[PDB]
RNA sequence: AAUAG
DNA sequence: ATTTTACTAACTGATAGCGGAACTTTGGGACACCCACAGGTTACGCGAAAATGGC
DNA sequence: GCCATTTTCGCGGCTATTTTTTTACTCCCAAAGTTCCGCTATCAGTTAGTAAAAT
């Protein structure tokens, strides 16, 4: 229907065209008949009838008279919904300045007229005159006159000049401006200017002036003469129960405006003294400002409730505004909510849904099937049958929900796995049954959690639920590619208990024909689960090439391991099961099943694993008791020794040998060492036991203690928590953060006393408060990321670019922090991977790196590769599939139409709650910094070289001595400048000292051309530069934190990308969060979207102008095709908030935040929104240009092309 | 639905093709090319796509044949 | 405001 | 010869119109002299950008 | 006329479920428009009766 949204100023004629009448009275409704009053705020003659196809007269009262205007009343015979669309207007007695174009800084009226805002308000507030037509006089336009001076010069000159005061004066000044003449004048003055401040001022004003010329807007439209009036049904006056009426504040504001306008007209008719008229004009301006934006001018007008009235700006803006409350999110039909319980019998694609809840949700479907099969004659009969709850209704409900998927949601929806589709199974009850294996995806536990349920209606929505959102499709984490349905808690415990090994168990040494006979022996009490036996195992191995090799052989194992092998799918080794299975081992089993067998086998295997784990956790009888907390006997001796040595240190303090700080430090170290020793003794005592073997000797066995089993299996519990249960609680911190000298020398088994419990509460409260506040901080960060990255969609397959990024193993010392395989898995090669010391092309260009090619890279000892990146993609809009690579949630190359920006933002934002020289290897030494290369050729030690045993190339043997989490991420993604940033070498050249000017110092550099560049340095700067040295560009002169903007300016796009990615990944890896770097690269790409033009060239770009990079690239391609001088630009790094606010579309920018500024700028500019991103199409109700809608939008782009 | 995405290649394209086929079996009078087995039109369309009977080109060809007739 | 996750 | 039906005339209710008096509603007036207002508020904090001030 | 310091401006997680608020105050009169009850009168619909027709 429509292809774009156009915004701009409104002329008086346009406002009159919108209007169906003029509001002349502040009347709303009669106080007896409750009918609209004529020419009032609710007039039926202006806005439409109050009843469908009726008039206030009651004369024309049917559809026979549609479109006929009653002569007695004037009310058109039509529908009542027209009162939601018909607008009105007020003819203002005096012009009024628009508050947005006056006080939304910077002021557009002031910028256009080149007069300060204070002067404009002085003219408006009737304090100072201003010259409109200077005439044949020394007076100039825009020069201010006081009343005294105005009277003086009125006597002096007379009618030669015109001087006015108020909004009429500003309108006359704006109407008399010659815009092309001003544009020429600013261009000429910019040609012959040197100061950068005046250059900025003239470039801003010139941009405004030429925007006004191009848009067709006239400046005097910024001063209102006709005021539009909203439809009444959008500001309703509706009756409540008991005769009370509820009204909108807009009615009060409009009534104030109308009353003051009528009083102004009456005063002008009475020829009142000028002071009264000036007062009335001030009040009219104040009333209109309050109606448009309350509180911007001054004291906000308040109603009888003593609270500020809500204006139109408040209608459209804010968290509670129309954009966010009603347009970006809505309340929906066919939805429900209930508490969630656990269904351990369900399959991964099934969810237990209550019968009554399904009956309410699927009601139209039940009506349709009752009508179809003849059980109900009409729809009212079907309604009666459903209300009476007949058995045939239940059969119809089963047939309806037979294969209809349903969507389950849990708030907060931190990532897309917070909504998944399931096949419903009708259950008796009122609680939703949720599959256990999906709980980790939902962050859902059964302690009172509630879930919402939605019914997809159309066939497309049903197929989207089945194909995309179904739980069996989403078993990999889109953030990292790791499985997300890994078993936890009881399952793991069961699999741990069944696969453990016991010495001299019943049935040891027995020979078993296979898993079935192991199960038979277990069920007959012949052998225990933990009996060491020999079992004939038939194992099938599916190789990389697809070879299926079957080998039968006798393996030493346990009964439980074979019984578990019974459910393992064919194609996997028995070594994955022939061990004790903790959480990590089961994770490995599922990962190998996915990597070597597929998706269906993995789903069946996961279901069987969870069934078996539950069953054998039940059969184990694992229980927690007070005797399971074994406190070591060494704890008391260690406490006594620590106390005695603390007394000795106190005695030394009283002798003056050591200071107070030393005493504090060594007491703390004493207690920390004591805690470590007690923990070690407790773990050693709890981890082992002594058993009698078959020969009768004593053997050491791993303990079957319940708490030890729970912790070791990874089901629940860790070393620190067992420490607290059976060892020492340890040193605790004060609310400010300092450590208390005496620790809690008691565990939870013994019980704390009052002081120890109070000290514990000190830290417990801090933890809870920190969680509560970081929730809001993380939410705001995630929203900002989603806004900045919402437009990134895979639009092509290959962009045909040769650029890429250099990838190397991450070395932060003597060990690898992360391997090259983990970084390269899923990325497309950009330059051929030649074998080291050889010219054979091991891996060609444009090949996805999967597990097989990762093993190939690892075997041949390759250090540095080059891969395609989203930051270096050349696509005009969005990115292409090759520059992105593998879709982590799907395992293959990313498909066209995938909204990867939203995925990146969710992947980064979801873990925000969790957020708070001697050689060690043998090889040679290479200098660049210090690098220690192994014999294979891989770089394994990267060390700094401050300004050495072995020189360059000299081999070194091992042992030779050659010689704040979430705020940090937010500051990195906002491109914040550090407080004391490092001073970097602006240009490459020879350093030279300079004249130490008072206050702060200066230095100079001589370039290769002999030109001298002067740098300004603060006094307190430990300069690392020496005269006569040719410092390269980007070299550090003064040490300090590095600004990302300086990195971009002096090193390039790759350097800033690496910096941001490394810092963010350092923060995330400190806490153990696995997030792929392509998400951070997508965000950084959205950060590098603007360029400032340095050379104007011949393209339609002004110097010093911040414009979109894609537009410049397209223009440069066109100009090169035309063989003309291209534009020269410097790319800019913006924060995610600033980048979001500086997008091309004003709908998205307004929907994000700062609605008034965005709308004011768009209105003065006359912007046009093409609806190219997701948010715009969400707001206007259209299909998003991603995924299933992608193709649709493409088709339209063809039809517009044709 | 791994077989269906293997036969089509793109999940979004598979959704669109299956939606067209399901609308043909539900709103239109077209009959299934596989045993229905008490299945909804969406599942029937997915099974037909998996069997290789229904593709985008096949649907376009049948639409062209209907237009010719 | 209070409460649940 | 009898029974069903079509035709017609009279009754009655709804309804548009009118009368007229009560009822609601609007505009004007009031002559000792009176002659400048509120009016609660705020223990935020942080970052940007925009407006002032310094020499 | 640029370098720093003070002043505004806008922002601060998502789903549920329990429940209204409260000061402040002339009177009278004449003139005008509107309403409410009662009556009239006309038209259309309904119903009862009787002749016309058919069995
Ligand atoms: Mg919970
Ligand atoms: Zn009317
Ligand atoms: Zn690309």
Curated annotation (Swiss-Prot), chain A:
EC number: 2.7.7.6
Cofactor(s) demanded: Mg(2+); Zn(2+)
Reactions mediated catalytically: RNA(n) + a ribonucleoside 5'-triphosphate = RNA(n+1) + diphosphate
Presence of keyword Zinc: yes
InterPro entries: DNA-dir_RpoC_beta_prime, DNA-dir_RpoC_beta_prime_bact, RNA_pol_asu, RNA_pol_N, RNA_pol_Rpb1_1, RNA_pol_Rpb1_3, RNA_pol_Rpb1_3_sf, RNA_pol_Rpb1_4
Lineage: superkingdom: Bacteria
Family: Belongs to the RNA polymerase beta' chain family.
Oligomeric and partner information: The RNAP catalytic core consists of 2 alpha, 1 beta, 1 beta' and 1 omega subunit. When a sigma factor is associated with the core the holoenzyme is formed, which can initiate transcription.
Protein name: DNA-directed RNA polymerase subunit beta'
Organism: Vibrio cholerae serotype O1 (strain ATCC 39541 / Classical Ogawa 395 / O395)
Gene giving rise to this polypeptide: rpoC
From Swiss-Prot, chain B:
One function term, GO molecular function aspect: DNA-directed RNA polymerase activity
Signal peptide boundaries: none
Keywords (A to Z) from UniProt: DNA-directed RNA polymerase, Nucleotidyltransferase, Transcription, Transferase
Family per similarity comment: Belongs to the RNA polymerase subunit omega family.
Known role: Promotes RNA polymerase assembly. Latches the N- and C-terminal regions of the beta' subunit thereby facilitating its interaction with the beta and alpha subunits.
Highest taxon of the lineage: Bacteria
Protein name: DNA-directed RNA polymerase subunit omega
Enzyme nomenclature, EC number: 2.7.7.6
Quaternary organization: The RNAP catalytic core consists of 2 alpha, 1 beta, 1 beta' and 1 omega subunit. When a sigma factor is associated with the core the holoenzyme is formed, which can initiate transcription.
Catalytic activity, reaction form: RNA(n) + a ribonucleoside 5'-triphosphate = RNA(n+1) + diphosphate
GO BP of this protein: DNA-templated transcription
Enzyme type, top EC level: transferase
Residues of the full protein shown: 6 to 74 of 90
Source lineage: Bacteria, Pseudomonadati, Pseudomonadota, Gammaproteobacteria, Vibrionales
GO cellular component: DNA-directed RNA polymerase complex
């Amino acid at each position: 229907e429509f292809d774009a949204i156009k915004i701009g100023l409104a002329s008086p004629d346009m406002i009159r065209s919108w209007s169906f009448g003029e509001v002349k009275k502040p009347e709303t409704i009669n106080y007896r008949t409750f009918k609209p009053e004529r020419d009032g705020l609710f007039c039926a003659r202006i806005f439409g009838p109050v009843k469908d196809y009726e008039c206030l007269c009651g004369k024309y009262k049917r559809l026979k008279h549609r479109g006929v205007i009653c002569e007695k009343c004037g009310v058109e015979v039509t529908q009542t919904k027209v009162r939601r669309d018909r607008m009105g207007h007020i003819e203002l007695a005096s012009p009024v300045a628009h508050i947005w174009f006056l006080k939304s800084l910077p002021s557009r009226i002031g910028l256009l007229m080149d007069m300060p805002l204070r002067d404009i308000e002085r003219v408006l507030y009737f304090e100072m005159y201003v010259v409109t037509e200077p005439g044949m006089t020394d007076l100039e336009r825009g020069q201010m006159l006081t009343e005294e001076e105005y009277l003086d010069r009125l006597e002096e000159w007379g009618d030669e000049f015109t001087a006015k005061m108020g909004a009429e004066a500003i309108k006359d000044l704006l109407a008399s401006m010659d815009l092309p003449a001003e544009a020429e004048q600013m261009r000429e003055e910019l040609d012959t200017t040197n100061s950068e401040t005046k250059r900025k001022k003239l470039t801003k004003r010139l941009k405004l002036v030429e925007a006004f010329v191009a848009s067709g807007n006239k400046p005097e439209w910024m001063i209102l003469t006709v005021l539009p009036v909203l439809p009444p049904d959008l500001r309703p006056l509706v009756p409540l129960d008991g005769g009370r009426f509820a009204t909108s504040d807009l009615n009060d504001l409009y009534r104030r405006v109308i009353n003051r306008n009528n009083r102004l007209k009456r005063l002008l008719e009475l020829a009142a003294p000028d002071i009264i008229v000036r007062n009335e004009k001030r009040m009219l301006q104040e009333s209109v400002d309050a109606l448009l934006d309350n509180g911007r001018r001054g004291r906000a007008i308040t109603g009888s409730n003593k609270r500020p009235l809500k204006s139109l700006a408040d209608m459209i803006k804010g968290k509670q505004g129309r954009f966010r409350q009603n347009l970006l999110g809505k309340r929906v039909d066919y939805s429900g909510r209930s508490v969630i319980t656990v269904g351990p019998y369900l399959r991964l694609h099934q969810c237990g849904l209550p019968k009554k809840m399904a009956l309410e949700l699927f009601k139209p479907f039940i009506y349709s099937k009752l009508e179809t099969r003849g059980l109900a004659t009409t729809i009212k009969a079907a309604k009666k049958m459903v209300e009476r709850e007949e058995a045939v209704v239940w059969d119809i409900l089963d047939e309806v929900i037979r294969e209809h998927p349903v969507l389950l949601n849990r708030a907060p929806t931190l990532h897309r796995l917070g909504i998944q589709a399931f096949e419903p199974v009708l259950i008796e009850g009122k609680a939703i049954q949720l599959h256990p294996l999906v709980c980790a995806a939902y962050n859902a536990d059964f302690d009172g959690d509630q879930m919402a349920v939605h019914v997809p209606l159309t066939l497309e929505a049903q197929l989207e639920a089945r194909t995309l959102m179904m739980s069996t499709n989403n078993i990999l984490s889109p953030a990292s590619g790791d499985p997300i349905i890994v078993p936890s808690q009881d399952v793991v415990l069961g699999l741990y208990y069944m696969t453990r090994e016991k010495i001299n168990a019943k049935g040891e040494g027995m020979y078993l024909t296979g898993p079935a006979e192991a199960e038979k022996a277990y069920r007959t009490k012949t052998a225990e689960l933990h009996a060491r036996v020999k079992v004939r195992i038939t194992e099938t191995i599916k190789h990389e090439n697809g070879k299926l090799t079957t080998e039968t052989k006798m393996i030493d194992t346990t009964v439980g391991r074979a019984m578990l092998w019974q459910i393992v799918p064919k194609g996997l080794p028995y070594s994955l099961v022939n061990q004790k299975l903790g959480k990590k081992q089961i994770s490995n089993l599922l990962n190998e099943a996915y990597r070597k067998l597929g998706l269906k086998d993995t789903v069946i295997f996961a279901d069987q694993i969870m069934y078996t784990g539950f069953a054998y956790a039940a059969l184990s009888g694992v229980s927690v008791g007070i005797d399971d907390m074994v406190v070591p006997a060494a704890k008391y001796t260690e406490i006594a020794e620590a106390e005695e040595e603390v007394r000795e240190i106190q005695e030394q303090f009283q002798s003056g040998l050591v200071t107070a700080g030393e005493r504090y430090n060594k007491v703390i170290d004493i207690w920390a060492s004591t805690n470590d020793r007690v923990a070690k003794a407790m773990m050693e005592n709890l981890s082992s036991e002594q058993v009698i073997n078959r020969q009768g000797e004593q053997e050491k066995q791993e303990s079957f203690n319940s708490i030890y089993m729970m912790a070791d299996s990874g089901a629940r519990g860790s070393a620190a928590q067992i420490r607290q249960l059976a060892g020492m609680r340890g040193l605790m911190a004060r609310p400010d953060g300092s450590i208390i000298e005496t620790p809690i020398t008691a565990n939870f088994k013994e019980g704390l006393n009052v002081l120890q419990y109070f000290i514990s509460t000190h830290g417990a409260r801090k933890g809870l408060a920190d969680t509560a506040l970081k929730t809001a901080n993380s939410g705001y960060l995630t929203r900002r990321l989603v806004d900045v990255a919402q437009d990134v969609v895979v639009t092509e397959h290959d962009c045909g670019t040769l650029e890429g990024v250099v990838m190397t193993p991450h070395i932060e010392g003597g060990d690898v922090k992360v391997a090259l395989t983990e970084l390269a898995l899923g990325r497309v090669v950009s330059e051929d991977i030649l074998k080291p010391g050889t010219d054979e092309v091991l891996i060609p260009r444009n090949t996805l790196l999967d597990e097989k090619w990762c093993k190939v890279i690892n075997d041949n000892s390759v250090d540095q590769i080059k891969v395609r990146s989203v930051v270096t993609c050349d696509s005009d809009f969005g990115c292409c599939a090759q520059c992105y690579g593998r879709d982590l949630a799907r395992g293959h190359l990313v498909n066209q139409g995938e909204a990867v920006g939203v995925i990146a933002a969710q992947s980064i934002g979801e873990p925000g709650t969790q957020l708070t020289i001697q050689a060690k290897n043998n090889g040679s030494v290479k200098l660049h910094e210090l690098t220690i290369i192994d014999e294979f050729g891989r770089t394994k030690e990267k060390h700094k070289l401050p300004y050495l045993s072995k020189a360059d190339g000299d081999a070194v043997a091992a042992g030779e001595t050659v010689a704040g989490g979430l705020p940090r991420v937010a500051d990195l993604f906002e491109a914040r400048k550090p407080k004391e940033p490092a001073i970097l070498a602006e240009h490459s050249g020879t350093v030279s000292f300079g004249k130490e000017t008072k206050g702060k110092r200066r230095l100079i550099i001589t370039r290769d051309s002999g030109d001298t560049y002067e740098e300004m340095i603060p006094k307190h700067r430990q300069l690392n530069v020496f005269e006569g040295e040719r410092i390269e560009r980007g070299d550090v002169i003064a040490d300090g934190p590095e600004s990302p903007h300086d990195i971009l300016r002096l090193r390039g796009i790759h350097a800033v990308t690496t910096y941001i990615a490394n810092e963010v990944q350092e923060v995330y890896r400190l806490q153990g969060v696995k997030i792929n770097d392509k998400h951070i690269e997508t965000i950084v790409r959205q950060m590098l979207r603007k360029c400032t033009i340095t050379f104007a060239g011949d393209s339609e770009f002004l110097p010093g102008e911040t414009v979109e990079y894609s537009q410049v690239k397209i223009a440069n391609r066109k100009l090169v095709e035309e063989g003309k001088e291209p534009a020269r630009f410097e790319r800019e790094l913006l924060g995610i908030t600033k980048a979001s606010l500086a997008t091309e579309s004003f709908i998205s920018a307004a929907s994000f935040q700062e609605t008034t500024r965005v709308l004011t700028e768009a209105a003065v500019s006359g912007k046009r929104d093409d609806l190219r991103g997701l948010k715009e199409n969400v707001i206007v109700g259209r299909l998003i240009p991603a995924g299933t809608g992608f193709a649709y939008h493409q088709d339209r782009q063809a039809k517009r092309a044709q | 639905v791994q077989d269906a995405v293997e036969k089509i290649g793109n999940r979004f394209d598979l959704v669109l093709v299956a939606a067209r086929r399901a609308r043909q079996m539900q709103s239109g009078g077209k009959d299934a090319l596989v045993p229905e087995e008490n299945d909804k039109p969406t599942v029937i369309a997915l099974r037909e796509i998996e069997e290789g009977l229904i593709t985008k080109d096949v649907l376009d060809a049948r639409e062209r044949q209907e237009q010719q007739e």
